[PDB]
Amino acid sequence: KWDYDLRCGEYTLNLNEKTLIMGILNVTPDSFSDGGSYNEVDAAVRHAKEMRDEGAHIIDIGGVSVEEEIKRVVPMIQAVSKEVKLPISIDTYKAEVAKQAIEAGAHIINDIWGAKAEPKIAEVAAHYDVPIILMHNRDNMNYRNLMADMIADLYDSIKIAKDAGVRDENIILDPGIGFAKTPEQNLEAMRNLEQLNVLGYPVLLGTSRKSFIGHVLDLPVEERLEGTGATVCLGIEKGCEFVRVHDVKEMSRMAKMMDAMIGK
Amino acid sequence: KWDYDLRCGEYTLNLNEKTLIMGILNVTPDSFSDGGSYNEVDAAVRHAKEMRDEGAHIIDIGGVSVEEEIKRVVPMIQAVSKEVKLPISIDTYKAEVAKQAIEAGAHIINDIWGAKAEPKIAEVAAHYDVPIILMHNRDNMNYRNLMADMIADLYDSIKIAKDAGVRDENIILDPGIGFAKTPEQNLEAMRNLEQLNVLGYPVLLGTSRKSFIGHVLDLPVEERLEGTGATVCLGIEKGCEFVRVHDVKEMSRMAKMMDAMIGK
Numbered sequence: 001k002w003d004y005d006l007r008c009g010e011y012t013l014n015l016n017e018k019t020l021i022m023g024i025l026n027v028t029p030d031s032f033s034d035g036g037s038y039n040e041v042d043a044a045v046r047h048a049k050e051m052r053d054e055g056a057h058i059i060d061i062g063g064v065s066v067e068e069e070i071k072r073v074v075p076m077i078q079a080v081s082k083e084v085k086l087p088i089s090i091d092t093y094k095a096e097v098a099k100q101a102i103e104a105g106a107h108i109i110n111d112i113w114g115a116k117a118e119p120k121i122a123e124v125a126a127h128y129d130v131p132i133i134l135m136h137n138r139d140n141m142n143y144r145n146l147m148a149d150m151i152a153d154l155y156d157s158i159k160i161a162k163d164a165g166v167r168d169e170n171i172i173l174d175p176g177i178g179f180a181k182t183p184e185q186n187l188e189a190m191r192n193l194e195q196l197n198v199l200g201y202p203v204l205l206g207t208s209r210k211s212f213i214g215h216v217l218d219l220p221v222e223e224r225l226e227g228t229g230a231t232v233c234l235g236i237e238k239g240c241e242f243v244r245v246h247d248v249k250e251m252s253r254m255a256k257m258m259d260a261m262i263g264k
Numbered sequence: 265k266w267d268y269d270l271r272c273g274e275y276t277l278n279l280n281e282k283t284l285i286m287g288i289l290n291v292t293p294d295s296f297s298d299g300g301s302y303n304e305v306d307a308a309v310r311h312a313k314e315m316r317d318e319g320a321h322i323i324d325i326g327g328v329s330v331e332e333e334i335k336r337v338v339p340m341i342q343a344v345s346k347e348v349k350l351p352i353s354i355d356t357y358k359a360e361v362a363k364q365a366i367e368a369g370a371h372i373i374n375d376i377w378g379a380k381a382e383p384k385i386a387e388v389a390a391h392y393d394v395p396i397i398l399m400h401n402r403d404n405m406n407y408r409n410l411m412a413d414m415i416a417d418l419y420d421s422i423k424i425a426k427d428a429g430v431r432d433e434n435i436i437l438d439p440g441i442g443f444a445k446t447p448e449q450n451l452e453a454m455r456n457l458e459q460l461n462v463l464g465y466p467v468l469l470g471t472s473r474k475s476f477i478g479h480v481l482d483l484p485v486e487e488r489l490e491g492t493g494a495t496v497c498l499g500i501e502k503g504c505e506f507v508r509v510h511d512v513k514e515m516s517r518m519a520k521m522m523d524a525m526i527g528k
C-alpha cells in the first residue's frame with residue numbers, strides 16, 4: 001500500500017506494518033526557569049522513556065514568546081534524542097522554532113497550522129529534508145461542505161509545502177479534529193475520515209482526550225480513555241497511519257488489535 | 265434501518281438508537297449447594313445491579329447435569345428479574361433449561377449451538393414467542409470458505425428455528441467468535457463481519473476477553489480490556505446490534521462513542 005518508508009534521519013518508519021503511535025510529551029515547565037532546568041528535562045526524559053516503553057513510535061514535543069519557546073524546547077529535544085532512541089517530532093507552527101528543534105535533534109515537524117501560519121516553516125522542512133505533518137486548521141468554522149472544504153484546505157497546505165520544495169514522501173496530513181470544528185463536525189470528520197486517503201498522503205489522527213469525546217460521553221478529560229480508544233479504532237479502520245495519543249500503553253494495545261483484525 | 269423493536273415481554277429494545285450491551289453475569293456457584301443459596305444469588309444480583317448501573321441493556325445468565333443446571337439458574341433468574349429491571353437472556357443450548365428459565369423470568373434465549381444441539385429449543389422459543397440468539401458453532405474447524413461456510417451454518421440454524429415456528433423478528437445471529445475457529449479465522453471473521461448483514465437479522469458480537477485477543481496481544485485474560493475494546497469498536501462499525509461483554513462500564517462507553525461517530 002505504501003511504496004516508501006517514512007525517512008526520519010537516523011530512524012525509519014514502516015507505514016505498512018502497523019499503526020504508528022505518536023506519544024504526547026508532558027512538557028510541564030518550571031516556574032523561575034528560562035528552560036533547561038534539571039526537574040523540567042528529567043521529568044520529560046522520564047516520560048519519554050515511559051512512553052517508549054509503552055509502545056510509542058514517535059515522541060511529540062511542544063509548547064512564552066519565540067525566544068522562550070526555543071529555550072524551553074531545545075534542551076528537551078537535546079536530552080530526549082540523546083536518551084530515548086525514538087524519532088522526535090517538534091510540535092510547532094513557527095519557522096524559527098522548527099529550525100532550532102531540528103538543529104537540536106528533532107526529526108519530524110508537527111505543524112497545527114499546515115504551513116499557513118508561517119509559510120517559511122515549509123522552507124525549513126524542505127531544507128532539512130524532514131517529514132512535516134500538515135494539520136487541517138482554519139480561523140473559522142464557516143464551512144460550505146466540511147469534508148470537501150477540509151480537503152481543499154489540506155491541499156492549500158500541500159501546495160505551500162511543495163512550492164517550498166517539500167517532497168511528497170515528507171508530507172503527512174492530519175484532519176485536525178477539535179480544531180475549527182463543532183463537536184458535531186468532529187464526529188462528521190471521524191465518520192468520513194477515509195475520504196482523506198484520496199489525496200495519497202499518510203494520515204495522522206489526533207483525537208486523544210479531546211473535547212468532542214467529552215461532549216458525546218459527558219465525561220471530564222481524565223475520564224476519556226474509552227472514548228479516545230473508540231476514535232483511535234475508527235481512525236485505523238478508516239486507514240490512518242499514525243495516532244497521536246496521551247495514553248500510550250492502552251492505545252498501543254488497541255492499535256495492535258485493530259491492525260491484526262484489518263490485516264495491517 | 266430496523267423496522268421493528270426487539271420485543272422482550274415486559275421490555276423493548278430499540279435496535280436503531282444504540283449498540284445494545286449484553287453484560288455477562290458472574291454465576292460463581294457455592295460448593296455444598298444444589299443452587300438457590302443466599303451467597304450465590306446475592307452475589308449475582310449484586311453483579312446484575314452493578315452491570316445495570318454501568319450501562320448494560322441485557323443480563324446474560326448461564327452455567328452439573330440438566331437437573332442441576334436448572335436448580336442453579338432458575339433461582340438466579342427469579343431474583344435478578346425481580347430486582348433488576350432489565351431483560352435477561354438464558355445462556356443455554358438445552359431445550360429443558362430454556363423452558364425453565366423463561367418460566368422463571370428469562371426473556372431471551374442465548375443458544376451457542378444455534379438450535380443444532382437440541383432442535384426442540386426452537387420449539388421452546390417459538391412457543392414463548394421470545395427472541396433467540398443463534399450462534400455460529402460447529403464440531404470442527406474444517407472450512408472450505410470461512411465466511412461462506414459460517415453463513416451457510418447460520419442459515420441451517422435459521423431454518424431449524426423458522427421450521428419450529430420462530431418469527432423472523434425473534435431471530436438474532438452471532439458469528440460465534442472463538443468457537444470452532446483458529447485465532448486466525450477469528451481475525452478473518454472480524455475483518456468480514458459485515459457480510460452477516462445480508463442475512464437481514466440483528467447481529468450479536470461476543471468477543472470479550474477471548475483467546476484470540478490474547479493471541480494477538482500476548483496478554484493473559486485479565487489484561488484484555490483494550491483488545492476487547494478494539495473488537496467491540498470494529499464490530500459496531502461493521503454493523504452489529506449487540507455486544508456481549510464482561511467489562512460493561514468500559515465497553516458501554518466505547519459503544520456510545522462509536523455510535524455517535526457512525527451516526528447510530
Ligand SMILES: C[C@H](CC(=O)O)c1nn(C)c2nc(N)[nH]c(=O)c2c1=O
Pocket residue numbers: 024062091092110111112133135174176177178204205206207244
Ligand atoms: C491542541 C492539542 C494540544 C496538545 O495535545 O498538545 C494538539 N496539539 N498538536 C500539536 C497536534 N498536532 C497534530 N499533528 N494533531 C493534533 O490533533 C494536535 C492537537 O490536538
Ligand SMILES: C[C@H](CC(=O)O)c1nn(C)c2nc(N)[nH]c(=O)c2c1=O
Pocket residue numbers: 288326355356374375376397399438440441442468469470471508
Ligand atoms: C464460551 C463463552 C463463555 C462465557 O463467556 O460465558 C460464551 N458463552 N456464551 C453463552 C456466548 N453466547 C453468545 N451469544 N456469544 C458468545 O460469543 C458466547 C461466548 O463466547
